Design a protein around this ligand. Sequence first.
Ligand SMILES: *[C@@H]1O[C@H](CO)[C@@H](O[C@@H]2O[C@H](CO)[C@@H](O)[C@H](O)[C@H]2NC(C)=O)[C@H](O)[C@H]1NC(C)=O
Ligand SMILES: *[C@@H]1O[C@H](CO)[C@@H](O[C@@H]2O[C@H](CO)[C@@H](O)[C@H](O)[C@H]2NC(C)=O)[C@H](O)[C@H]1NC(C)=O
Ligand code: IFG
Ligand code: IFG
Lengths: 480, 480
Amino acid sequence: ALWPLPLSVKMTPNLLHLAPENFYISHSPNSTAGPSCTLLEEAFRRYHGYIFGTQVQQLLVSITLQSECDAFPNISSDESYTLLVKEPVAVLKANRVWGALRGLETFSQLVYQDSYGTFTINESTIIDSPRFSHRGILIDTSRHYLPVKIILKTLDAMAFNKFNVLHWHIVDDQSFPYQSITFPELSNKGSYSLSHVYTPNDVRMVIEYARLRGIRVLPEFDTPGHTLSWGKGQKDLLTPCYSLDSFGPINPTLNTTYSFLTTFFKEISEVFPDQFIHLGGDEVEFKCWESNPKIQDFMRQKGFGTDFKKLESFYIQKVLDIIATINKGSIVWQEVFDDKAKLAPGTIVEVWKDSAYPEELSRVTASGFPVILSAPWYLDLISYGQDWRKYYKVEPLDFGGTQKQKQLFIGGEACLWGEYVDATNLTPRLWPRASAVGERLWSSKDVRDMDDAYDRLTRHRCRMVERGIAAQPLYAGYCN
Amino acid sequence: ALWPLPLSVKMTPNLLHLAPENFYISHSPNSTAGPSCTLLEEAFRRYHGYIFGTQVQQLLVSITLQSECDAFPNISSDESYTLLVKEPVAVLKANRVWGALRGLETFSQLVYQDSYGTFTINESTIIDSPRFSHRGILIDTSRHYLPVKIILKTLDAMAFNKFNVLHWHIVDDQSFPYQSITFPELSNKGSYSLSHVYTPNDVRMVIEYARLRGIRVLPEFDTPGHTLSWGKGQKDLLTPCYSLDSFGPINPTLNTTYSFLTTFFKEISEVFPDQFIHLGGDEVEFKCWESNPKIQDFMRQKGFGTDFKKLESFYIQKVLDIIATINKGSIVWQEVFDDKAKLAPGTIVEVWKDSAYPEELSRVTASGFPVILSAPWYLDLISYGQDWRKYYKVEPLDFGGTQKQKQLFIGGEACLWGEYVDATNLTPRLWPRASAVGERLWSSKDVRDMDDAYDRLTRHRCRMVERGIAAQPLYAGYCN
Ligand SMILES: *[C@@H]1O[C@H](CO)[C@@H](O[C@@H]2O[C@H](CO)[C@@H](O)[C@H](O)[C@H]2NC(C)=O)[C@H](O)[C@H]1NC(C)=O
Ligand SMILES: *[C@@H]1O[C@H](CO)[C@@H](O[C@@H]2O[C@H](CO)[C@@H](O)[C@H](O)[C@H]2NC(C)=O)[C@H](O)[C@H]1NC(C)=O
Ligand SMILES: CC(=O)N[C@H]1NC[C@H](CO)[C@H](O)[C@@H]1O
Ligand SMILES: CC(=O)N[C@H]1NC[C@H](CO)[C@H](O)[C@@H]1O
């Protein structure tokens, strides 16, 4: 009942037992980590609880290289491990802490209770490492505020599924819950209410809780579109519309805009330790810019004519430069690439439009840019039946291109946009549909047997329910 | 913020206040009901909690006719009431207890807290009665078992929405959780497990909890198809298949079948006090009957040829006769009608197939039968976005027919089939999508303004959340 299915699993028929109050998870004497390693100590304790809730007496955890116990994970973090289940001492070996975390999850999925309640595990050898290094979940806390507790629950479910990136789409048009220290008015005026806000301490808590599970927190502060809430607190930032709505995208002709964004993103570079910041750039509406006389004047001032993609490009290039100056990397939705913005090498492009996405993947990678796929995994787009199968059947590298282009494909994300999602329905909608994407992103390309996937996923889903994650059914049946 | 919108609402600008520990709901001196009326006493207490959780000091409740306080509701129950909100004593007047229950819900929807927390209500006069008398929710406890507590929660949400029928699709192919007293093996062998069973006391609890809210419990024991679980405990009931699956529909050639069904339905007539029993009759598969030599012999014995609709008709007519003999009424899915079964006058037909349903409604009613519509309200068939609007826009009487035929349309049901639904996701999936159907079935035909519906429904949904029903969002926003 392994999910995702490990790269290599070899088992024997020899059954071994475990005794809950005489089973300890501890550091191997040769490990680079010890009791000082909070991340491993906390993992040992919570996995002991998950496991239980001829005798294998102990699980020894050996970290081989500098452990990275006090660091934040990044795109290059080594999540490989091996697990040797035998008596009297099983061994989990990993280059780094990140792999040991993954291996503790796998170990917990191997232990089961027989018909008489006896805790049991098969002698086995597992070798495992992920197919892709970027394995994300997008949550949207603007369309609806999500209490910190459900973000923490989502992070727990992510760990059970070996997801390693929380793409936090923190702000958008409808609300601005991010409490900024340098700009207090953004949240004071842009939040749904003063109790629908993420304080600096809420953000640190999420980041740290994520870190303890090997999960990166990727912040998205989408501009120049998707910024209506920003205008409440930052005066003169948005373009006033002459006519359809009242305010449009951020005004890219003003120096106060770039001055504001410089101070703002500098704060973000300090709050969020991840190497990458997602700058957004999706669905920018030009009508408001088109209808504005001052923008029209700016357009002719540098020969952009009536091509507002050049103005969007001009804007996004200035933001990308601000990010590079503060030594962070940038991620961008595909529109930025499609509208001909000049992107510096290393800029990641997230391909989200479902129309000819394989052809988009070829173009991005042929231009030399790293790419992330979310297009066929828009989990907010619900439908009747077993749609997990359609997410599962995606083979992300089925696009035209050389091996060099295929090496630029670094992973993907399951996206849960928030228009129709809040605390009442997030979890059942997310899980186990996102588990399908999790396996496609972790396991080998040839892991695609549908019957076996259904068998393992129904049990994995029951395991999620047992651990307090209200994952919905795949089909008729029951748990226990 | 009324939902469903009452027939007639007239308000003044005069605001009146309420004091939580000096506001009592009590029986008017002329009422036919008093302290002995458990149904009203319990309603007074729970509505006091819902309300609070120049002064109107008291809400007097006057029942005009024999109250029916100790009875079960039926299709003809009078749910009309008037509500006069004034100082110092507001008055709720109703012919029967059923209307007072509806009026207590409406009264609770009129009370609100101003910006300073002051409990407030407008002086007003409401006259109200339902457009249709059958307003149902179908739950499916076979595809997944539902704990009694979530059935009780569903009944609470039903009351908030003025639904009055719980269509309990209790058994089906996948499991038989109904614990039968006369046939203990049905559940012992057919349930998912022994802890996934509705005991006689569970069933009484549901029925009584429903009664206290003016809700009828309509049991469905679907035959001859949808009976795989029945065969585990009742040997020789199902037809053995020669070849696609193992067992097919109930065997209608054996006297042991009708003997079993006679004893079985007699027990059902005693357990479920509602006048109607839903006999099902949907999706009967003939291949198994076609492949069976003994059935083939029976087919030629009375000249049915190769027309298995005649065998289905023969079977269903014998069951309908068993129900009539025990003095209950029958409800049947449309297939029974479409396949030319001879139905006695009074048999209700439930139109569920989405293909040309208006033409089905004309045929059924032209044949003189009462009809219930569920076709466009299959809430298990989820999709992206505001699908509440499509359920809301249905005008059920838009079919061809005379006024006599239109008087045979007695109501409808929102159906939540269970293939993909259990305790983890039932409530958010059900509510507030079912609220759309609730208004269409309660309120006037001309109540269709979409903007006003969205305004009242987002607030009604927030009210459901406040009362512990985890109803999902309609769109971006927040509650409180
Ligand atoms: C883990 O160990 C068990 C017990 O040996 C394996 O189970 C059985 O396999 C044997 C022979 O392969 C059969 O004779 C038994 O009927 C199986 N079950 C029982 C009750 O012992 C199981 O296959 C092992 N897991 C794997 C995948 O290697
Ligand atoms: C219930 O009473 C209130 C208070 O009188 C009504 O509210 C206002 O309507 C008056 C005139 O119609 C306006 O001057 C106010 O601006 C409104 N609000 C406030 C703050 O008083 C309300 O309309 C009444 N409800 C209905 C539908 O009759
Ligand atoms: C990058 C992106 O996806 N932008 C938007 N596109 C549609 C989504 C709903 O499916 C959300 O509205 C989201 O904000
Ligand atoms: C009357 C009826 O609806 N029969 C079936 N039809 C399809 C449903 C799923 O949408 C359920 O399987 C249900 O049992």
